[PDB]
Amino acid sequence: VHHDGFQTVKATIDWEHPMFKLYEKAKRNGKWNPADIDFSQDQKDFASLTSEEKISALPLVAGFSALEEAVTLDILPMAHALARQGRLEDVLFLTTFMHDEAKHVEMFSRWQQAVGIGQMDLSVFHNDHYKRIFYEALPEAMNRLYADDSPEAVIRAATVYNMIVEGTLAESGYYTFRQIYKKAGLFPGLLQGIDYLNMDEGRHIQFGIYTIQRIVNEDERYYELFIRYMDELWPHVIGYVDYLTELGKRQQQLARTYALEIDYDLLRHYVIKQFNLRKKQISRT
Amino acid sequence: VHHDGFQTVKATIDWEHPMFKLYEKAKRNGKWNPADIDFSQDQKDFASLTSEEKISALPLVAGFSALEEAVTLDILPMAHALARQGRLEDVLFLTTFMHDEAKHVEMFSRWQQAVGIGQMDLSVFHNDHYKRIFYEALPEAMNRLYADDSPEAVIRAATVYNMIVEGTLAESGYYTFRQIYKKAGLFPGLLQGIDYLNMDEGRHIQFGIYTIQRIVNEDERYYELFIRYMDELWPHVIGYVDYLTELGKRQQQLARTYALEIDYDLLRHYVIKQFNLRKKQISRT
Ligand SMILES: CCCCCCCC(=O)O
Ligand SMILES: CCCCCCCC(=O)O
Ligand SMILES: [Fe+3]
Ligand SMILES: [Fe+3]
Ligand SMILES: [Fe+3]
Ligand SMILES: [Fe+3]
């Protein structure tokens, strides 16, 4: 379908648009390159583990590698729908979003390669709840935007992607990585990568908050849709958390070897806390 | 539609894929930020011009600002179609492509703002041939990919976008900018921007060559489709070139003021040369 005009021919960028400002920050804070991370110490750490200590870390890496890959692919329909509404500054920012996610995919794949599990298929650690969110509901809600860009549809896409997948699960995964392996002194390259990912994620979540809030602001009834879509996904959120928890409670040789009181009750409550504070960043009014 | 698996969970990135290597180079060579360009000298240059010297430079800026904006929006369907075919490394690279184009839009808009023409609507310098390529045929060929990702459709999208819009028109515009204003000592910020754009453009054109060649390689008959779609667009290419040429031949006060023998016959032959060497970068075999 045709371009009727061009904003930067008729006028300029809206330099005060929040998403143009977030775009600017993304360029400033987005220079990191996963190709510069030194994973040589991670290779040695991983090889030094027992086979039982080795399994301990694979579930979380499985959940993240697919997370990053899903969101790299699944942001495209959001950029399309906003482009078609003429929201140029949103699109500018989203180019940084998509590129961040490509780096995230790259970072986890480089780690798997470097530690020697690239040839191992980690799909086994995706249980039914994980598959529901990442194999199904995330691509459903995003691909919807190709044919339905109603406020309802846009809110639901930003809820699943930015508020749940990123704002709840990814954020809790970053915390979990630090609580466990940063305590242990293991896997320094991977944790440098996690620190960069977590910084990028702040912008991703702010795009979701801005997107959701700008639609709530038009019609306070969309607040309820937001809460509702958060609650609809919680069962799968926690059911993946319990599944990982059981996996860790059954494989505790890395816990004992490195003197890590892995506090699953505290990881669980951090997930709960993430979920509820994402709610509280959307004002009904 | 659902993800069946994830390549970086089952395996890794194909680290030897040409588009993964181009992605890597894009990160290394893609750090420039239009927000760092100093346009203060451009503001003074532009204000020092006569009204007749002022008009001289606006057509080319009009053609480019819409070019960058069109290609920022219109690359999205290519990333989608390749994502859906599972071509992960292509997608990784294309995130750098889309972000480059956002910076290109940004660069021209910052110049217009800084020199004081942001509020002026430059659409008047888009004649009928330009509108056919950029308002119509480019978005048609790209949006097609949402519903038809046949080799025919992919070849035609890369021909219009990478080989014509970028590989022929943009490349000739860069040359034209240097031949004219770099000679004059005018507009140093803008020309720094053009140098960065031209570097980015090399990767864009190589994605198009790779994309077109990998389909030609399957079936040598697609070579003819390539040539044919190049020839179909040439009339509008040159008809925009003639239109700009007449505009410059009629407004030659900037030419005289800065002692610039503007050689339109040489700009024309450079456009012709670009068009033909893009053909010669696709091997029929
Ligand atoms: C203790 C397990 C809870 C952490 C959530 C991990 C989310 C993810 O890995 O994508
Ligand atoms: C002498 C005019 C020929 C240069 C082609 C300019 C292409 C563009 O401005 O997008
Ligand atoms: Fe990510
Ligand atoms: Fe993210
Ligand atoms: Fe460009
Ligand atoms: Fe380009």
Side-chain angles (χ1 to χ4, degrees):
Chain A
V1 86
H2 294 0
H3 305 289
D4 280 341
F6 297 99
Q7 175 180 330
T8 60
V9 172
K10 296 147 112 183
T12 70
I13 291 163
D14 178 6
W15 311 105
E16 304 302 311
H17 197 284
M19 290 305 99
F20 185 74
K21 284 172 280 162
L22 197 62
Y23 166 75
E24 287 283 306
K25 294 176 180 60
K27 289 180 298 180
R28 296 284 183 201
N29 301 335
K31 296 308 195 221
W32 78 282
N33 189 343
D36 295 328
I37 297 170
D38 181 346
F39 291 111
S40 56
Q41 184 57 49
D42 285 54
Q43 170 183 345
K44 287 169 199 161
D45 292 346
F46 198 81
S48 85
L49 300 177
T50 66
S51 270
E52 309 217 359
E53 289 165 347
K54 275 186 169 84
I55 269 292
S56 265
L58 295 190
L60 222 71
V61 177
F64 255 108
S65 260
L67 186 152
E68 308 303 337
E69 193 171 322
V71 300
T72 304
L73 311 176
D74 292 344
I75 192 55
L76 289 166
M78 179 69 73
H80 173 76
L82 301 183
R84 188 175 50 197
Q85 298 173 1
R87 300 192 130 263
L88 181 61
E89 296 78 20
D90 288 44
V91 174
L92 301 186
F93 163 72
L94 281 166
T95 74
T96 73
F97 195 141
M98 300 195 278
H99 185 58
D100 290 343
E101 301 302 5
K103 298 192 294 180
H104 297 176
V105 172
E106 181 193 351
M107 192 282 297
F108 285 112
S109 209
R110 287 186 174 276
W111 182 83
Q112 285 190 228
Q113 175 72 38
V115 299
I117 67 174
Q119 79 285 355
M120 183 185 309
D121 180 338
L122 306 183
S123 308
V124 55
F125 304 117
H126 296 157
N127 77 328
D128 59 309
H129 290 280
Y130 183 99
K131 277 175 200 232
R132 177 60 206 150
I133 286 161
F134 287 96
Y135 287 55
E136 308 181 13
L138 170 68
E140 281 168 14
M142 305 315 294
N143 263 276
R144 171 169 176 190
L145 299 179
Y146 283 128
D148 168 20
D149 66 338
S150 60
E152 170 186 343
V154 171
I155 270 180
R156 176 134 194 243
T159 300
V160 181
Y161 190 128
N162 307 115
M163 300 310 268
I164 295 295
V165 158
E166 292 175 315
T168 301
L169 292 175
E171 283 291 336
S172 302
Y174 303 145
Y175 184 75
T176 294
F177 267 114
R178 292 181 192 109
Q179 287 300 316
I180 300 189
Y181 305 93
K182 197 148 84 127
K183 186 179 173 183
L186 288 173
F187 295 151
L190 178 58
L191 278 168
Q192 178 171 55
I194 294 287
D195 281 342
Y196 288 131
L197 265 53
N198 201 162
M199 281 174 63
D200 302 330
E201 202 71 276
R203 297 186 302 270
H204 303 181
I205 296 165
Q206 297 174 61
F207 163 85
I209 290 164
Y210 166 85
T211 292
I212 292 165
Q213 188 67 59
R214 73 170 165 80
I215 290 166
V216 166
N217 282 7
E218 261 23 80
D219 178 345
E220 158 185 89
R221 272 166 292 154
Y222 288 119
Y223 181 89
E224 266 69 39
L225 285 213
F226 168 60
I227 301 303
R228 180 192 307 157
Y229 301 132
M230 293 289 278
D231 298 341
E232 277 179 43
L233 286 162
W234 175 257
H236 303 283
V237 163
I238 198 73
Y240 172 63
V241 167
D242 301 340
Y243 160 82
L244 287 177
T245 283
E246 163 201 2
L247 251 169
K249 286 178 176 166
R250 275 207 280 100
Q251 179 50 241
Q252 269 217 19
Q253 190 52 245
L254 186 151
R256 301 160 176 167
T257 285
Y258 286 82
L260 332 153
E261 268 207 330
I262 296 178
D263 199 334
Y264 299 98
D265 290 315
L266 187 73
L267 299 177
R268 186 198 184 78
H269 292 329
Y270 189 97
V271 174
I272 291 167
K273 176 216 194 335
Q274 290 300 321
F275 178 80
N276 288 314
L277 71 91
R278 284 321 150 202
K279 289 186 168 186
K280 299 169 61 182
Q281 287 178 292
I282 303 301
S283 148
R284 141 169 238 127
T285 71
Chain B
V1 86
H2 294 0
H3 305 289
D4 280 341
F6 297 99
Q7 175 180 330
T8 60
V9 172
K10 296 147 112 183
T12 70
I13 291 163
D14 178 6
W15 311 105
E16 304 302 311
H17 197 284
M19 290 305 99
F20 185 74
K21 284 172 280 162
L22 197 62
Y23 166 75
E24 287 283 306
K25 294 176 180 60
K27 289 180 298 180
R28 296 284 183 201
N29 301 335
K31 296 308 195 221
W32 78 282
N33 189 343
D36 295 328
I37 297 170
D38 181 346
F39 291 111
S40 56
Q41 184 57 49
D42 285 54
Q43 170 183 345
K44 287 169 199 161
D45 292 346
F46 198 81
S48 85
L49 300 177
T50 66
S51 270
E52 309 217 359
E53 289 165 347
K54 275 186 169 84
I55 269 292
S56 265
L58 295 190
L60 222 71
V61 177
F64 255 108
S65 260
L67 186 152
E68 308 303 337
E69 193 171 322
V71 300
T72 304
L73 311 176
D74 292 344
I75 192 55
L76 289 166
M78 179 69 73
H80 173 76
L82 301 183
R84 188 175 50 197
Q85 298 173 1
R87 300 192 130 263
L88 181 61
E89 296 78 20
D90 288 44
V91 174
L92 301 186
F93 163 72
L94 281 166
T95 74
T96 73
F97 195 141
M98 300 195 278
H99 185 58
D100 290 343
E101 301 302 5
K103 298 192 294 180
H104 297 176
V105 172
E106 181 193 351
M107 192 282 297
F108 285 112
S109 209
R110 287 186 174 276
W111 182 83
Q112 285 190 228
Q113 175 72 38
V115 299
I117 67 174
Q119 79 285 355
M120 183 185 309
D121 180 338
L122 306 183
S123 308
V124 55
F125 304 117
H126 296 157
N127 77 328
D128 59 309
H129 290 280
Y130 183 99
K131 277 175 200 232
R132 177 60 206 150
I133 286 161
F134 287 96
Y135 287 55
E136 308 181 13
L138 170 68
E140 281 168 14
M142 305 315 294
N143 263 276
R144 171 169 176 190
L145 299 179
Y146 283 128
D148 168 20
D149 66 338
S150 60
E152 170 186 343
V154 171
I155 270 180
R156 176 134 194 243
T159 300
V160 181
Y161 190 128
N162 307 115
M163 300 310 268
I164 295 295
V165 158
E166 292 175 315
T168 301
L169 292 175
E171 283 291 336
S172 302
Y174 303 145
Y175 184 75
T176 294
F177 267 114
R178 292 181 192 109
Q179 287 300 316
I180 300 189
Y181 305 93
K182 197 148 84 127
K183 186 179 173 183
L186 288 173
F187 295 151
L190 178 58
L191 278 168
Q192 178 171 55
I194 294 287
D195 281 342
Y196 288 131
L197 265 53
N198 201 162
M199 281 174 63
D200 302 330
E201 202 71 276
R203 297 186 302 270
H204 303 181
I205 296 165
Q206 297 174 61
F207 163 85
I209 290 164
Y210 166 85
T211 292
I212 292 165
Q213 188 67 59
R214 73 170 165 80
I215 290 166
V216 166
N217 282 7
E218 261 23 80
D219 178 345
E220 158 185 89
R221 272 166 292 154
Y222 288 119
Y223 181 89
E224 266 69 39
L225 285 213
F226 168 60
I227 301 303
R228 180 192 307 157
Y229 301 132
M230 293 289 278
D231 298 341
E232 277 179 43
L233 286 162
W234 175 257
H236 303 283
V237 163
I238 198 73
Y240 172 63
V241 167
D242 301 340
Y243 160 82
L244 287 177
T245 283
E246 163 201 2
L247 251 169
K249 286 178 176 166
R250 275 207 280 100
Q251 179 50 241
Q252 269 217 19
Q253 190 52 245
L254 186 151
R256 301 160 176 167
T257 285
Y258 286 82
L260 332 153
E261 268 207 330
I262 296 178
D263 199 334
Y264 299 98
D265 290 315
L266 187 73
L267 299 177
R268 186 198 184 78
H269 292 329
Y270 189 97
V271 174
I272 291 167
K273 176 216 194 335
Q274 290 300 321
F275 178 80
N276 288 314
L277 71 91
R278 284 321 150 202
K279 289 186 168 186
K280 299 169 61 182
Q281 287 178 292
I282 303 301
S283 148
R284 141 169 238 127
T285 71

